[PDB]
Design a protein around this ligand. Structure first.
Ligand SMILES: Nc1ncnc2c1ncn2[C@@H]1O[C@H](COP(=O)(O)OP(=O)(O)OP(=O)(O)O)[C@@H](O)[C@H]1O
Ligand SMILES: [Mg+2]
Ligand SMILES: [Zn+2]
Lengths: 145, 607
DNA sequence: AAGCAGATATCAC
DNA sequence: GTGATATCTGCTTTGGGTGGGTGGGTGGGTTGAGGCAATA
């Protein structure tokens, strides 16, 4: 009963395996001057100081991050009756786009169950509400691009 | 002995327990009466009852089972012989309803105490004989003697009594008296396992009537005595290791998972006008809108008539796009059938289809007189394809390996699931070229069904509502569905038991005319049918007759068989270019239009 | 170190 | 004085590579690299 986090280089893995993943993220690095300049500035600072450049909000240490993660995991939020129609409306919208794209996307009935799974995870961070479904939807469509 | 056990007091207390205890006529008095009626000399006693009546007797039973249980046997025997003036005397088997310990928490303080543990059986040994009484014969005068075993040690005689010769008594092994013993390996239950640790295992020893009472795969609560035994350093020396090994002496097993009224209910169902559709609906309530596939699977479950001159078995292949409900259907059929096997065509698979010193027959042989569900049909290698063709054509599996030459009966119905070679079904491609399997193998299936994924929005919305409703289904509905499934299983069992349909004259004429018409369709313009299909119809017709619980095949059965066959062909025999009537794709693997185009290409290149 | 095979002196009747 | 029967003495054991690969792997020892036939 474990979660699977896989990393692969595009060539050809079987489709029967790729459709099982809730999120399939294609990380593509297209060269662009300003972004490449910003990335280089970040990396040089890390080599220069052995830590990330300062930001407005300070990152939390691992010791402290593992406490919140465990604390959140105790909750068991549930999805109400009311959201049933709204989640359904999102599913058909995703399906329509997949058929229109004509790409090798894996939007199927399995996708509907994935919306619920992510939505409850988002709530466990925060009873599920419409804002968790919106974040779950946004995260997934951004994945299929 | 360091025990506060007075035998007489314990026996009296237990006799009092049998006399007076009442389950909230004494319960165990009724049990003794039932023992007399049945004749099985075993009385099971719930330790919770003994605790409730008497807390001292319970405490002594748990602490000193070896000493106390025989006194219980004496008490029960005395009482029973009073109330009813049997191969053996009755034996008490105290047990705990629920486990009192976890396999991981067994401790030295529990040695020689009565405990209950839960687990799953993985291995059982063959029977081990234990000597109880040794038999000696003088090698000079043939005088015979018998010696009782004493704590695993035997007092060999030194001088013959009759002739006084010394060292003349030889042990005759096969004139002695032996009792049965069995070694069982119990695996820790998945629920009680801590996260990420490998399961623990325990050794159990069963004796006499408790041997062969469990089989590998069983989930059982075992009540027995915890034992510690020394380990010899090597077989030759009498030195022992300071760390003891442990096992459990089994005392009680508890396996933790027709009637005339039942037959009357089944017949009442069989009288209903729409029994076919009722059973089809009950077959797989979770799957949505696949009515014809469900009807075909029901007919496969019932099967045709075993003529004993003719395969009576119905083979069904479900090919389709990924993300449909094919695996769920296969799982539901596997659960339903009594002698079924669920397996995969991939070679790496844990359970294999092929037979492979112990002779290991594959799933196809194991599913003899049953259904074999094969999930990744398209992923079979060439050897597995040959094996499957042999099974489907001849219903036997031949092996010639490691000096063993034999033929194994495999009369099994194949329910197969197949995916396309591409990421999606290609409408331009026919069935043969969509799934890379030989046409010779495809021609052995009675029915091929296509589970395509629609582009319709309304279908998506309806399926979404179906799945959400299932996601919120209530416990009473689940229980009702389970009851309906049990009714279906009983109906199928009864039909297999007692119904053997036979072709009536009207059915024969209907079948002949049906075949002639199917041929005529092609003959009008190619060939639109071949004789093998006629056989399929017969099988299907018989299956339908069995669903009604009828011993005669009627014209209605033939009409239903024709409709189902014609629907399956319309699903899977369609040429994407022109039409459907062409069945040459199944017989030859190449579309007639494709054949003409290839002929044109070859002739042009020959120009 | 531990145990069986062989040799042999020794009590008992 | 003979029949046990109790005491004493010498052998070899173990698994092991100084005990061999000219004993044999049907007497019994994980891990890796290297030829085959069938394989794709
Ligand atoms: N017709 C349907 N009825 C019910 N559930 C369906 C249907 N079609 C798809 N589903 C849903 O899709 C999932 C079924 O996936 P399943 O493992 O059965 O697919 P499959 O057909 O074996 O395909 P594959 O192995 O290619 O993924 C479940 O969420 C099931 O609810
Ligand atoms: Mg599947
Ligand atoms: Zn004798």
């Amino acid at each position: 009963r474990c979660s699977i986090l896989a990393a692969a280089n595009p060539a050809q893995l079987p489709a029967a395996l790729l459709s099982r993943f809730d999120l399939l993220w294609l990380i593509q690095d297209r060269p662009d001057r300003d972004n490449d300049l910003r990335l280089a500035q970040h990396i040089t600072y890390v080599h220069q100081h052995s830590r990330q450049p300062p930001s407005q909000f300070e990152p939390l240490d691992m010791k402290l991050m593992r406490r919140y993660i465990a604390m959140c995991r105790e909750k068991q939020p549930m999805v109400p009756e009311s959201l049933a129609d709204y989640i359904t409306a999102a599913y058909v919208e995703m399906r329509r786009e997949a058929w229109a794209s004509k790409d090798a996307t894996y939007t199927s009935a399995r996708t509907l169950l994935a919306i619920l799974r992510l939505s409850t995870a988002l709530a466990r961070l925060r009873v599920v509400e419409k804002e968790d479904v919106n974040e779950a939807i946004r995260l997934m469509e951004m994945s299929k691009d | 002995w360091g025990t506060d056990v007075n035998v007489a007091a314990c026996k009296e207390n237990f006799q009092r327990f049998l006399q007076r205890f009442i389950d909230p006529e004494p319960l165990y008095m009724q049990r003794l009466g039932e023992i007399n009626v049945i004749g099985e000399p075993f009385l099971n006693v719930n330790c919770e009852h003994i605790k409730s009546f008497d807390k001292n007797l319970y405490r002594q039973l748990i602490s000193y089972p070896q000493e106390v249980i025989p006194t219980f046997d004496m008490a029960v025997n005395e009482i029973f012989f009073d109330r009813y003036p049997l191969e053996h005397q009755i034996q008490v088997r105290p047990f705990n309803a629920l486990k009192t310990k976890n396999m991981r928490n067994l401790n030295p303080e529990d040695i020689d105490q009565l405990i209950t543990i839960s687990g799953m059986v993985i291995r059982t040994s063959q029977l081990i004989p234990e000597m109880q009484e040794a038999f000696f014969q003088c090698q000079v005068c043939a005088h015979t003697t018998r010696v009782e075993m004493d704590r695993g040690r035997i007092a060999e005689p030194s001088v013959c009594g009759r002739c006084h010769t010394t060292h003349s008594m030889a042990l005759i092994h096969n004139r002695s008296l032996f009792s049965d013993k069995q070694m069982i390996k119990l695996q820790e239950s998945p629920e009680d396992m801590p996260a990420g640790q490998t399961p623990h295992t325990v050794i159990l020893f069963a004796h006499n009537d408790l041997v062969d009472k469990v089989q590998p795969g069983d989930r059982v609560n075992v009540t027995g005595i915890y034992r510690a035994v020394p380990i010899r350093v090597n077989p030759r020396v009498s030195n022992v290791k300071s760390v003891y090994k442990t096992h459990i002496d089994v005392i009680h097993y508890r396996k933790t998972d027709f009637s005339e009224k039942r037959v009357e209910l089944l017949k009442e169902l069989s009288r209903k006008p729409d029994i076919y559709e009722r059973l089809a609906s009950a077959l797989a309530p979770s799957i949505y809108e696949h009515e014809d596939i469900k009807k075909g699977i029901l007919l496969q479950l019932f099967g045709g008539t075993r003529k004993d001159f003719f395969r009576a078995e119905i083979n069904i292949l479900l090919c389709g796009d990924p993300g449909t409900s094919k695996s769920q259907l296969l799982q539901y059929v596997y659960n339903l059938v009594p002698r079924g096997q669920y397996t995969s065509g991939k070679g790496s698979s844990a359970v294999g289809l092929t037979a492979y010193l112990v002779l290991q027959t594959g799933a196809l042989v194991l599913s003899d007189n049953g259904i074999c569900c094969i999930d990744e049909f398209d992923k079979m290698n060439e050897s597995t394809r040959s094996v499957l063709h042999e099974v489907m054509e001849q219903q036997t599996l031949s092996i010639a390996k490691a000096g063993i030459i034999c033929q194994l009966n495999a009369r099994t119905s194949v329910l197969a699931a197949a995916n396309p070679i591409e990421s999606q079904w290609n409408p331009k491609k026919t069935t043969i070229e969509n799934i890379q399997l030989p046409h010779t193998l495809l021609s052995r299936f009675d029915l091929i069904f296509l589970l395509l994924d629609p582009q319709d929005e309304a279908y998506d919305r309806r399926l979404a509502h179906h799945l959400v409703a299932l996601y919120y289904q209530s416990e009473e509905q689940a229980e009702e569905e389970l009851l309906d499934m049990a009714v279906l299983k009983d109906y199928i069992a009864y039909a297999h038991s007692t119904i053997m349909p036979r072709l009536s004259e009207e059915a024969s004429q209907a079948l002949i005319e049906a075949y002639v018409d199917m041929r005529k369709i092609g003959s009008s313009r190619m060939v639109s049918a071949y004789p093998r299909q006629l056989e399929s119809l017969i099988r299907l017709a018989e299956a339908h007759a069995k669903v009604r619980l009828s011993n005669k095949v009627e014209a209605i059965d033939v009409e239903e068989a024709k409709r189902l066959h014609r629907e399956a062909l319309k699903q899977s025999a369609t040429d994407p270019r022109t039409g459907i009537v062409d069945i040459s794709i199944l017989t030859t693997g190449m579309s007639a239009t494709s054949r003409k185009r290839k002929e044109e290409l070859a002739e042009a290149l020959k120009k």
